[PDB]
């Protein structure tokens, strides 16, 4: 089966391409606690249709670029900017954590 | 081209062949597609040739080609016999 993931668009600043973020709950090998863990996929949005905040299903597909191997399969729910903001702070933090300069 | 042939499985001076289907370019004792019988030449036991005609027939039906020996053994276990 072409693998199908569900995710959150955290970027459409790109011609015909969305950045869907997909998470996966799972029990940890040694320690057993459940750990979340997430990965960014580039998805083919051929008709610049879906916008950030959309929650979409992503489908395994013959490659469109490198990085691009999925097409946005359908829309689930829309608008939910919590996870977008969630993901956005997450990277804003990186400003500190360094040697250099920037309020995180 | 896929063969039907004897892969060598005994030990030194004690040979046991394992009749198998395999791509003809495999090493003799390497990875095979399917075993369909065995054969001890030294007849050390009351059962020393076994086949499974159906699988043997199957493979032949799709152009498995038996070595001149495997064919002998195949024939002997009644693989060909149509009467």
């Amino acid at each position: 089966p072409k693998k199908v993931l569900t995710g959150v668009v955290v970027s459409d600043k790109m011609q015909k391409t969305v950045t869907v973020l997909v998470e996966r709950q799972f029990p940890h090998p040694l320690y057993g606690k459940v750990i979340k863990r997430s990965k960014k996929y580039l998805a083919h949005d051929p008709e610049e249709k879906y916008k950030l905040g959309d929650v979409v299903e992503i489908i395994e597909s013959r490659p469109i670029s490198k990085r691009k191997r999925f097409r946005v399969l359908r829309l689930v729910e829309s608008g939910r900017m919590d996870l977008v903001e969630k993901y956005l702070i997450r990277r804003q933090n990186y400003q500190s954590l360094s040697k250099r300069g920037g309020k995180a | 081209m896929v063969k039907i042939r004897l892969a060598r499985f005994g030990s030194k001076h004690n040979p046991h062949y394992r009749i198998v289907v395999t791509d003809a370019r495999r090493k003799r004792d390497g990875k095979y597609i399917e075993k369909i019988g065995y054969y001890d030449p030294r007849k050390t036991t009351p059962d020393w040739l076994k086949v499974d005609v159906e699988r043997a027939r199957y493979w032949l039906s799709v152009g498995a080609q038996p070595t001149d020996t495997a064919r002998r053994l195949l024939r002997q276990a009644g693989v060909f016999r149509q009467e």
Binding site: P27, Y31, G32, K33, V34 | -
Partner: protein
């Protein structure tokens, strides 16, 4: 805040028995209650009941001990020798039916929560499920 309310109860109970109270109050939840149902059934308590302290809903557990003993120290044997939370927050513990533990060669129980509901070890194995291993009691 109260991070695990089940351990709170499990403990609340452990604490009470070690000073031999007649009963103890836990603040109430169906899930807590659904455990006491088993504690009670398997003989570990005398049972419980929804009392009501200061207008908020509690489950009074009625504890159960041995008979008075011999020599120095006549404090009776405990019935709940031992009782401890297995699965906890930030370490949830789930088991297959083939993995539900034999506690003390069955001299003790192991309450677990399945989609057929809260159940003893013997209950789930002889009923074919598995679930979140809540706590051993022996």
């Amino acid at each position: 805040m109260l991070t695990d309310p089940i351990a709170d109860m499990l403990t609340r109970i452990r604490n009470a028995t070690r000073v031999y109270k007649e009963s103890t109050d836990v603040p109430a939840s169906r899930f807590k209650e659904e455990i006491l149902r088993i504690l009670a059934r398997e003989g570990f308590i005398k049972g419980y009941e929804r009392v009501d302290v200061d207008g908020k809903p509690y489950l009074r557990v009625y504890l159960k001990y041995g008979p008075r003993r011999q020599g120095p120290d006549p404090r009776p044997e405990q019935v709940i020798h031992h009782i401890r939370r297995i699965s906890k927050p930030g370490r949830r513990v789930y088991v297959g039916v083939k993995e539900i533990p034999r506690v003390r060669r069955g001299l003790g129980i192991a309450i677990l929560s399945t989609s057929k509901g809260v159940l003893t070890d013997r209950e789930a194995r002889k009923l074919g499920v598995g679930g979140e291993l809540i706590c051993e009691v022996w």
